[PDB]
């Protein structure tokens, strides 16, 4: 069983954060591959949030990327870290 992911830090709206978690649960079950999970989140977000979007899923990684204010959300699932930012 997979429990709802816990976000260490984020800059998202209350309505917006729920959508990211909802998309994340569907994406993890649909694709076994780590790259495939990242690819699905970016395409779904493109219709809702426009042309510019980026999704990265790494079990262990550390980096800083410039992102538009209120469009950056980082949530970590059990034993996996997913980072998505806009522009």
């Amino acid at each position: 069983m997979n429990h709802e992911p816990e976000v260490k830090a984020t800059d998202m709206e209350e309505d917006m954060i729920k959508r990211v978690k909802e998309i994340a649960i569907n994406a993890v079950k649909e694709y076994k591959q780590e790259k495939q999970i990242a690819h699905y989140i970016k395409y779904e977000f493109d219709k809702i949030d426009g042309y510019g979007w980026n999704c990265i899923v790494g079990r262990n990684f550390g980096s800083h990327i410039i992102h538009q204010t209120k469009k950056y959300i980082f949530f970590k699932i059990n034993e996996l870290c997913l980072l998505l930012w806009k522009a």
Binding site: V28, E30, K32, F61, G62, S63
Partner: protein, 143 residues
Amino acid sequence: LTAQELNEDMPSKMLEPKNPQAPKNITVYDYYTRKFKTDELVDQMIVHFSMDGDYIWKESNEYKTQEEIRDTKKALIKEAMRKQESEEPGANHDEEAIKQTLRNKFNYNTRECQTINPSIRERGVSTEPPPSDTICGNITQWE
């Protein structure tokens, strides 16, 4: 999918389309499943060279999306250049400067995020079963 009969009644063997070199099975862990997942079936196809390139033909569906991205960026740049030109008197700001000017500390925030990783360690463990000894026993009615 054909079988070749070896001469003089040898054990039968047949050829197969599947490439032998490709891994017998590929397994990818699924977080939703929460357990290791193994797929016996594999693509079994070998490509010597794979090339992905940014080449688009005229009036492509992808090309239209690219044009929209350029127009949206241009519109923001045009609005920023016009507003600065309108707000100031005889503004001489260059378009490149306005693009740099459009980015702001409040406008764009950069945060560096890393994932904690346990340090890799190398350890050697040796196991050796309990010592065994030979025993000889002779039993007689008198004993």
